[PDB]
mmCIF file of C-alpha atoms in Angstrom:
data_model
loop_
_atom_site.group_PDB
_atom_site.id
_atom_site.type_symbol
_atom_site.label_atom_id
_atom_site.label_comp_id
_atom_site.label_asym_id
_atom_site.label_seq_id
_atom_site.Cartn_x
_atom_site.Cartn_y
_atom_site.Cartn_z
ATOM 1 C CA UNK A 1 -12.644 9.564 1.100
ATOM 2 C CA UNK A 2 -9.386 10.002 2.907
ATOM 3 C CA UNK A 3 -8.019 7.180 5.117
ATOM 4 C CA UNK A 4 -10.179 6.517 8.073
ATOM 5 C CA UNK A 5 -9.131 5.070 11.346
ATOM 6 C CA UNK A 6 -12.024 3.516 13.302
ATOM 7 C CA UNK A 7 -11.403 2.987 16.954
ATOM 8 C CA UNK A 8 -13.415 0.115 18.500
ATOM 9 C CA UNK A 9 -13.433 -0.939 22.140
ATOM 10 C CA UNK A 10 -12.133 -4.144 20.511
ATOM 11 C CA UNK A 11 -9.230 -2.578 18.603
ATOM 12 C CA UNK A 12 -8.551 -0.177 15.731
ATOM 13 C CA UNK A 13 -9.244 -0.323 12.044
ATOM 14 C CA UNK A 14 -7.521 1.553 9.185
ATOM 15 C CA UNK A 15 -9.929 1.782 6.258
ATOM 16 C CA UNK A 16 -8.836 2.711 2.812
ATOM 17 C CA UNK A 17 -11.247 3.617 0.108
ATOM 18 C CA UNK A 18 -10.905 2.925 -3.613
ATOM 19 C CA UNK A 19 -12.041 5.433 -6.262
ATOM 20 C CA UNK A 20 -15.607 5.516 -7.417
ATOM 21 C CA UNK A 21 -16.481 3.242 -10.293
ATOM 22 C CA UNK A 22 -13.019 1.868 -11.087
ATOM 23 C CA UNK A 23 -13.078 -1.100 -13.507
ATOM 24 C CA UNK A 24 -12.628 -4.690 -12.341
ATOM 25 C CA UNK A 25 -8.982 -5.152 -13.264
ATOM 26 C CA UNK A 26 -8.037 -1.643 -12.180
ATOM 27 C CA UNK A 27 -9.470 -2.615 -8.750
ATOM 28 C CA UNK A 28 -7.374 -5.751 -8.599
ATOM 29 C CA UNK A 29 -4.137 -3.984 -9.678
ATOM 30 C CA UNK A 30 -4.781 -1.375 -7.019
ATOM 31 C CA UNK A 31 -5.441 -3.968 -4.378
ATOM 32 C CA UNK A 32 -2.413 -5.901 -5.356
ATOM 33 C CA UNK A 33 -0.198 -2.825 -4.985
ATOM 34 C CA UNK A 34 -1.362 -2.264 -1.480
ATOM 35 C CA UNK A 35 -0.892 -5.841 -0.457
ATOM 36 C CA UNK A 36 2.714 -5.759 -1.793
ATOM 37 C CA UNK A 37 3.306 -2.951 0.741
ATOM 38 C CA UNK A 38 1.767 -4.828 3.629
ATOM 39 C CA UNK A 39 3.868 -7.923 2.615
ATOM 40 C CA UNK A 40 6.943 -5.824 2.543
ATOM 41 C CA UNK A 41 6.184 -4.539 6.042
ATOM 42 C CA UNK A 42 6.525 -8.130 7.272
ATOM 43 C CA UNK A 43 10.034 -8.502 6.007
ATOM 44 C CA UNK A 44 11.351 -4.926 6.305
ATOM 45 C CA UNK A 45 10.937 -2.188 8.862
ATOM 46 C CA UNK A 46 9.331 0.490 6.686
ATOM 47 C CA UNK A 47 10.112 3.260 9.157
ATOM 48 C CA UNK A 48 13.730 2.691 8.099
ATOM 49 C CA UNK A 49 13.102 2.610 4.347
ATOM 50 C CA UNK A 50 13.115 5.483 1.913
ATOM 51 C CA UNK A 51 9.974 5.997 -0.040
ATOM 52 C CA UNK A 52 10.241 7.976 -3.373
ATOM 53 C CA UNK A 53 7.902 8.647 -6.383
ATOM 54 C CA UNK A 54 9.041 7.286 -9.712
ATOM 55 C CA UNK A 55 7.932 7.460 -13.268
ATOM 56 C CA UNK A 56 5.757 4.348 -13.130
ATOM 57 C CA UNK A 57 4.400 4.760 -9.595
ATOM 58 C CA UNK A 58 6.426 4.290 -6.406
ATOM 59 C CA UNK A 59 9.588 2.836 -5.027
ATOM 60 C CA UNK A 60 10.339 1.648 -1.485
ATOM 61 C CA UNK A 61 13.993 1.224 -0.791
ATOM 62 C CA UNK A 62 15.791 -0.702 1.981
ATOM 63 C CA UNK A 63 19.580 -0.115 2.304
ATOM 64 C CA UNK B 1 1.116 -4.875 -20.058
ATOM 65 C CA UNK B 2 0.714 -3.787 -16.393
ATOM 66 C CA UNK B 3 3.808 -4.658 -14.227
ATOM 67 C CA UNK B 4 2.989 -6.422 -10.952
ATOM 68 C CA UNK B 5 4.803 -5.312 -7.772
ATOM 69 C CA UNK B 6 8.384 -6.477 -8.134
ATOM 70 C CA UNK B 7 11.626 -6.430 -6.135
ATOM 71 C CA UNK B 8 15.024 -5.329 -7.482
ATOM 72 C CA UNK B 9 18.358 -5.732 -5.763
ATOM 73 C CA UNK B 10 22.085 -5.324 -6.188
ATOM 74 C CA UNK B 11 25.104 -4.369 -4.080
ATOM 75 C CA UNK B 12 24.166 -2.206 -1.079
ATOM 76 C CA UNK B 13 20.467 -2.191 -1.923
ATOM 77 C CA UNK B 14 17.047 -3.762 -2.215
ATOM 78 C CA UNK B 15 14.043 -2.053 -3.803
ATOM 79 C CA UNK B 16 10.295 -2.714 -4.161
ATOM 80 C CA UNK B 17 8.807 -1.200 -7.319
ATOM 81 C CA UNK B 18 5.070 -0.572 -7.544
ATOM 82 C CA UNK B 19 3.342 0.300 -10.798
ATOM 83 C CA UNK B 20 0.261 2.441 -10.958
ATOM 84 C CA UNK B 21 -3.068 0.801 -11.855
ATOM 85 C CA UNK B 22 -3.649 1.663 -15.565
ATOM 86 C CA UNK B 23 -6.207 4.059 -17.142
ATOM 87 C CA UNK B 24 -6.433 6.292 -14.155
ATOM 88 C CA UNK B 25 -7.476 9.941 -14.102
ATOM 89 C CA UNK B 26 -4.989 12.421 -12.551
ATOM 90 C CA UNK B 27 -7.191 12.459 -9.495
ATOM 91 C CA UNK B 28 -7.258 8.676 -9.021
ATOM 92 C CA UNK B 29 -3.500 8.594 -9.448
ATOM 93 C CA UNK B 30 -3.236 11.084 -6.584
ATOM 94 C CA UNK B 31 -5.572 8.873 -4.594
ATOM 95 C CA UNK B 32 -3.585 5.786 -5.344
ATOM 96 C CA UNK B 33 -0.364 7.445 -4.224
ATOM 97 C CA UNK B 34 -1.992 8.554 -0.912
ATOM 98 C CA UNK B 35 -3.379 5.046 -0.200
ATOM 99 C CA UNK B 36 0.194 3.613 -0.623
ATOM 100 C CA UNK B 37 1.432 6.499 1.542
ATOM 101 C CA UNK B 38 -1.232 5.725 4.282
ATOM 102 C CA UNK B 39 -0.023 2.147 4.338
ATOM 103 C CA UNK B 40 3.663 2.890 4.852
ATOM 104 C CA UNK B 41 2.708 5.368 7.532
ATOM 105 C CA UNK B 42 0.619 2.729 9.408
ATOM 106 C CA UNK B 43 3.637 0.332 9.266
ATOM 107 C CA UNK B 44 5.521 3.042 11.148
ATOM 108 C CA UNK B 45 3.183 2.929 14.154
ATOM 109 C CA UNK B 46 1.900 -0.673 14.044
ATOM 110 C CA UNK B 47 3.593 -3.956 13.186
ATOM 111 C CA UNK B 48 1.637 -4.981 10.149
ATOM 112 C CA UNK B 49 2.708 -8.655 10.564
ATOM 113 C CA UNK B 50 0.438 -8.650 13.555
ATOM 114 C CA UNK B 51 -2.461 -6.947 11.760
ATOM 115 C CA UNK B 52 -5.206 -8.379 9.654
ATOM 116 C CA UNK B 53 -5.475 -7.280 6.008
ATOM 117 C CA UNK B 54 -8.601 -7.900 3.848
ATOM 118 C CA UNK B 55 -10.736 -6.481 1.054
ATOM 119 C CA UNK B 56 -14.101 -4.994 2.046
ATOM 120 C CA UNK B 57 -16.726 -3.159 -0.043
ATOM 121 C CA UNK B 58 -15.111 -0.373 -2.050
ATOM 122 C CA UNK B 59 -11.781 -0.816 -0.385
ATOM 123 C CA UNK B 60 -9.295 -2.352 1.942
ATOM 124 C CA UNK B 61 -9.065 -2.755 5.706
ATOM 125 C CA UNK B 62 -6.175 -3.214 8.194
ATOM 126 C CA UNK B 63 -7.075 -4.150 11.767
ATOM 127 C CA UNK B 64 -5.070 -4.205 14.940
ATOM 128 C CA UNK B 65 -6.973 -5.835 17.808
#
């Protein structure tokens, strides 16, 4: 399932789906990587960051 | 074994490194990369410091009232 944006009369909701049947720790690792991005969006303005793919996964760069 | 999200810095630069969840099929890896990509893209339209983040059933949610 691709990202889904639900629009409520009470606001919007971005819903992200995790792959079918992942294990328990794979689910946490995944979750943790997304939260690191939301945390970084609180310190940095991500529209002004460069986002590249790396060997291990991904890299978000500021300055 | 699995590296947690970590920052790296030095002169003229600060980076956030994210490691892929382990034991993933090529498909799931593609899915993982798109999820991270959907999140940076939302931070470009919304201010995520003013949004709620939480785990739901088989996923994650980000709400902007």
